[PDB]
Design a protein around this ligand. Structure first.
Ligand SMILES: O=C(O)c1ccccc1F
Ligand SMILES: O=C(O)c1ccccc1F
Length: 516
């Protein structure tokens, strides 16, 4: 793979690539579609629009949008202007967004109408610097000074040239959280999505022009940003986007060609989703679908799920691991070489190391902490030098995962070095869930651990000491957690216990709860 030139704008790169196919569909959703040409036009008008409201080069904008055709216009339009979009999870709280606004010093917000209520709450509460709110598909009347996305784009002539950025200039941010503390602003360069799209999208998956890509993983996820934007645009594939929550039925509807008169050839999702599909009574048969490739990430794929999908479809699931910090997958199975119970082999272009207690290599068959050296690594966490030091060092990125290398050179997942649970593509902090539970007046103490369910998929499990003198039923606690947490954080079950095991410091011995 040839390195990008030092003068490089990733958006211009993707536009240029597709000038050969102006009339092919680039993106399609339930209500709209853009050809590559229409996408280019709208991308450049949005870039002009942002500039005309005074957003400058290197300044951030918040991109808080459901998957839809306006998403890649917002993302690429900012990048084409040399403005840095901060692409965020659409399921967070107003407080989360308030923090992001302050931390990013976002100068404008591009927001889906459905998300305007949360965003409004975030604006009201924070010391932000937002100059304009641009609403895609408004769902309530616009407030004074807000503008409709279609009008904002339609009101401005296309910018004539992209910003003259360098390959190693910041291009976009994603946010990633740890087990405590605020989300960290992961800063990616213009070169980074070129490398992931070439080393993984093209050279590993062998995506091609005639493909139709459909990712259950949304565009704000690093995994989904590659799957359903950078990868397909790099090869001229057509991409299907879906605003709604993925469920088996919504996925199957699309697999069967229920939207945009296209049937996906490449599907991407989490092991949890693949399990949920395989359990669905109306799972389609292989003759009804056009799938040629099925990708998975977001948690380790249990072997039985891959094996059952292959028995039903005659297609393997291709499991690989990436991270927000590395932008996309660096260790993967291949479309023609799958070893279930493993995450496969290093992706060419990326170097992997497993390190023991002192930094040194570990013998084969033994677990070590996983570190990655590749050209798509983020540069830093913005404004957090201490965490940057811990994660990015001398070209190596520390993943927080442990792995074992097998005799055939494959890698098998061995757990985490920090307590986070990966529940279907979203990291969930047990400590968050614990701090929520103890705010119920009937709960004295709470400990949350991950437990593998009947399909081998990790879900949170809560152990709760109730407060003597109150009543607290499992149902009231369910109602309370329904009211306080996103469903992606719910414990799969809660057990009431009389006490928890602790050190004399009062540290809860969570390892004993993963035992019995
Ligand atoms: O990945 C997912 O989140 C998903 C959810 C439902 C059905 C298929 C899927 F892949
Ligand atoms: O969940 C993953 O393995 C993953 C894959 C691609 C990019 C970011 C990720 F976190």
């Amino acid at each position: 793979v040839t390195p990008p030139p030092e003068k490089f704008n990733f958006a211009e790169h993707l536009l240029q690539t597709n000038r050969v196919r102006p009339d092919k569909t680039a993106f399609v959703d339930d209500i709209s579609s853009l050809s590559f040409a229409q996408l280019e036009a709208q991308t450049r008008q949005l870039a002009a629009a942002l500039r005309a409201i005074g957003v400058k080069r290197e300044e951030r904008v918040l991109l808080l949008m459901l998957d839809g055709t306006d998403w890649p216009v917002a993302f690429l339009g900012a990048i084409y202007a040399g403005i840095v979009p901060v692409a965020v999870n659409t399921l967070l709280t107003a407080d989360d967004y308030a923090y992001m606004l302050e931390h990013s010093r976002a100068q404008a917000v591009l927001v889906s109408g459905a998300l305007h209520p949360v965003l409004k709450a975030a604006l009201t509460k924070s010391d932000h610097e937002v100059q304009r709110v641009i609403v895609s598909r408004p769902a309530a009347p616009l407030e004074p000074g807000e503008v409709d996305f279609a009008e904002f784009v339609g009101a401005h002539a296309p910018l004539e040239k992209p910003a003259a950025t360098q390959a190693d200039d910041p291009a976009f941010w994603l946010y990633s959280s740890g087990s405590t503390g605020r989300p960290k602003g992961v800063v990616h360069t213009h070169a980074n999505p070129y490398w992931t799209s070439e080393l993984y999208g093209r050279n590993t998956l062998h995506l091609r022009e005639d493909d139709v890509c459909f990712s259950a993983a949304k565009l704000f996820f690093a995994y989904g940003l590659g799957n359903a934007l950078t990868f397909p645009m790099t090869v001229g594939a057509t991409t299907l986007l879906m605003g709604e929550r993925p469920t088996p039925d919504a996925v199957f509807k699309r697999w069967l060609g229920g939207v945009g008169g296209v049937k996906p050839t490449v599907f991407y999702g989490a092991p949890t989703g693949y399990a949920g599909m395989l359990a669905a009574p109306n799972l389609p048969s292989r003759d009804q679908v056009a799938l040629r490739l099925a990708s998975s990430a977001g948690e380790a794929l249990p072997a039985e799920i891959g094996q059952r999908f292959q028995r039903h479809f005659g297609l393997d699931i291709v499991d690989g691991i990436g991270s927000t910090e590395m932008l996309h997958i660096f260790l993967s199975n291949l479309p023609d070489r799958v070893r279930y119970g493993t995450t496969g082999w290093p992706v060419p272009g990326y170097q992997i190391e497993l390190r023991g207690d002192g930094g040194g290599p570990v013998a084969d068959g033994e677990p070590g902490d996983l570190y990655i050296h590749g050209p798509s690594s983020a540069t830093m966490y913005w404004g957090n030098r201490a965490k940057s030091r811990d994660t990015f060092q001398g070209g190596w990125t520390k993943s927080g995962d442990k792995y074992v290398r097998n005799d055939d050179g494959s890698y098998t997942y061995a757990g985490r070095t920090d307590d986070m649970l990966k529940v279907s593509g979203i990291y969930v902090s047990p400590f968050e869930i614990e701090a929520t539970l103890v705010q119920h007046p009937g709960v004295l103490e709470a400990a949350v651990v991950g437990v593998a369910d009947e399909h081998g998929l990790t879900k949170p499990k809560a152990y709760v000491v109730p407060r003597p003198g109150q009543t607290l039923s499992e149902t009231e606690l369910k109602t309370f957690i329904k009211d306080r947490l996103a469903p992606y954080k719910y414990p799969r079950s809660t057990v009431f216990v009389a006490e928890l095991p602790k050190t004399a410091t009062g540290k809860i011995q969570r390892f004993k709860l993963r035992e019995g």
